[model samples]
Every structure is written in C-alpha cells, then in structure tokens.
Target: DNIEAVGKKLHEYNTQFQEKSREYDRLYEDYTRTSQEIQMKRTAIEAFNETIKIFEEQCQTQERYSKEYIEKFKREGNETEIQRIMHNYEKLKSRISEIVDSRRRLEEDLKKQAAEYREIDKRMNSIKPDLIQLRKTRDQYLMWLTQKGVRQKKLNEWLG
Candidate 1:
C-alpha cells in the first residue's frame, strides 16, 4: 500500500514561476504614467478652480446688468442670485468628479500591481530551500528507480 500524494505545491510553483517570469508584469512605464496622469488632472483641477473664481466675478456682473455693465452686483440676500450661484458650481462639479474617479482608479491599479509583484517575489523566495531539498530527493528517487528496475511494475507484470 505504498502511495504518494502530490498536493497543490506543484501548481503553486508553476503559477509563481511562469507568470512572474514574464517581463510585461514589470509595469515600469505604468508606474510613472499613473503618477503623471494624476498630477496632470490635479493641475487641471487647480486651473479650473482659478477660472471658476474669475468666471464667478464676471457672472456677478451679468447677473445684475447684462447691458455692458462692469459694476459689482448685490448678490447677497437675493434668492435669485443664490440660485444663480448653483449654475457655476454645477458646471465644475461634473468635471471635478471625473478627475477624482480617474485618479482613484489609477492609484488602485498601481497598488494592485505592486502587491502582486511583492507576493510573487515573497513566495518565490520562500521556495528557495524547498527547491534544493526537492532536487536532492528527486535525484535519489530516480537513481533507485533505475537500479531497482521499478518493483511496482514488476509486481504488476507478475500479477497479470
């Protein structure tokens, strides 16, 4: 009743080896690009905020008198003015949301890729000692099988 069990280690070894061995997983460009993308979007958002300030100042004039007037409008305590305030902020709201979403997704992607690299690296390091022992055991078993001529096969032949 001699039997051997080969568990999931072989598949684990293959996955960690074959997949990690590929060069594309490096993401050297993606790492830099993700950072650059976030920075670019954030810079645009800052510029947008500045423009909103200038636009609001301009809109204040338009809200009061659209007859080529440059004087300041009394926007305070005016319900219509308060409602008009929403128009400027609302225009920027959608753009700000877009920037935030793209930024979050890129950051998450970078983190996930880095985590995968680290996990694969750690797992491979852990198998270093196991590889040495496995090689030694494999060679010894192979030599025995060669010299002894496979006792189980001989037994099967005799039984048949």
Candidate 2:
C-alpha cells in the first residue's frame, strides 16, 4: 500500500515536471526571439548614429563656408551676399535640430527594447532553480523505488 501511494504521488510529480519542462522550452524559444530582436535594434541604433555623424560633419562644413562667405561679403560691402549667407545659416540650424530629434527618438526606442529583453531574461533565470529542484526530486524518487523493489524481493525470499 505504501508503494502504491508513493507510485501515485510520483506519477503526479512526473506530470508536473512534464508541464514545467514544456513551459521552460517555450520560454527558451521566446528568449531567443527576443534576443534577436534586441540585436536588430542595436544594429539600427548604430546605423542611426552613423547617419548623425555624417549630418554633423556636413553641418560643420556648411557653417565654415557660410562664415567665410559672410566675412568676404562684409569686407566687400556686398549687402545682398551677406543676407543670403545669413539665410543659409538659419537653414543649417533647423536641419541640425531635426537630426537631434531623430537621434533622441532612436535612443529612446533602443532603451525600451533593451528593457524588455532584460525582463524576459530575468524571468528565464528565475525558473532555473525550481527546475533543478524538480529534477533532483524525480531522481531521488526513482532511486528509492529501485531500492524498494530489491528489499521486497529479499523479504519474500526470506519468508519462503
């Protein structure tokens, strides 16, 4: 009767282990997919940074030219040329603002994606200890069953 009861309880534990195993597998898959997504987001952020660098370089070049043009125009007393250079400077300032805004938004999105990935990673790690415990319990139960069978055989023989 004790063996039967132990057997029933072991079966229930085995069922729970199977379900947990399935859950772990599903979580593992999700983690993989999330990791890939984070990588893609990182790549995108790098590309955006490169674009920002190019834009900054271009802005610097334009500012240098604009300054030089205005200085020459002022020395020559050419009001028309000076006005044109001033307008160009304003346009460059607007373009720089737009570039900064774009970079800010990209950075924000990257942070959000990274946070999501970390959350999933935390959850996956959290279940690891419980899984280990369940596996150990199952092993111990199987070993006990084996020893019980051996004792049962010996006791029957002694009685005979």
Candidate 3:
C-alpha cells in the first residue's frame, strides 16, 4: 500500500547518511596525514636538541683550550699555536650560529603544522554529531519498516 512512500523516505535517509560518512572519511584522512607531519617534525626537533648539546659541549672545551693557549702565548710568546686555537674557536662559533638559525626556522614550520592539524581535528569533530543523528534516523526507519510487516528479504535488499 504505502510501502513505496516509506521506502522513498528510507532511501533519502540512507543517501544523507552515506554523504556524511564520506565527509568523515575525507576528514579522517587529512587528520591522519597531518599527524604524520607533526610526528616527523618532532623527530627533527629531537635531533636538533642532540646536535645543539654536542656543539655546546665542544664549544666549551674549545674556550678552555683558547684560555690555556692565551697564557702560553703570554709566557712563551709562541704566536702560531695560539692563532690556530683562536681560528678553531671562530669556526665552532659560526657552526653554532648556523644551527641556531636553522632551528628557528624549523620551530616556525612546526607551529604552522600544529595549527593545521588542530584545524582538521576540529572539522572532524564538528560533523560527528550530524553523522550520528543520520545513523539513528536510518535505524528508526528500518524499525518502522519491520513493524509494518516488511519481509526480511525485502528489508535486506532495501538496506543493500
């Protein structure tokens, strides 16, 4: 009798549910990709921390050597060894400066990546309630069709 009208409503409900599911799928994909990007950046940050530690340790040792060489140049008046130590100290300073500059750039990029990840996460959260409601509507329609004496095979076929 009015089965066709019920089926029409069910069909449209299913359509809406399917569309929302696809939207969620796309957002989840973006969320996953953005997380990986953040992961990579954090690993790079760790490596930079290690490199800075090593460079600072070497720089301190070079400073001690420069001090000792200065005393030797004053007492023994040997200029060549003192000159070499000073040159090495300058080289270490330049390397540390370059590392600090690169670290600043990486930190800025990481901040942007974190913001992008949060944006995608917020969008995904926003649609979840709509998707849940659509699912509940689809199930309600199914139950109604069942109570109206729709055959199992017919319900299965409609669900498909």
**Global lDDT of each candidate:** 0.51, 0.74, 0.86
Tens digits of per-residue lDDT for model 2 on 67-121? 7766766767778877776687788778878878887887887788788778878
Clashes of 2: 0
For candidate 3, the per-residue lDDT at 146 reads 88
Model 1 TM-score is: 0.35
Candidate number of the best TM-score: 3
Off by over 4 Å in 2: 69-89, 150-160
Ranking by TM-score: 3, 2, 1
Off by over 4 Å in 1: 1-90, 148-160
Could you estimate the TM-score for every candidate?
0.35, 0.72, 0.88
lDDT string, candidate 1, 72-117, tens digits: 3444345565456557657656565665666566567656656665
Which of 1 and 2 is ahead in TM-score? 2
Task: Report the Cα RMSD per candidate.
Answer: 11.1, 6.8, 2.0
lDDT of model 3 at position 127: 97
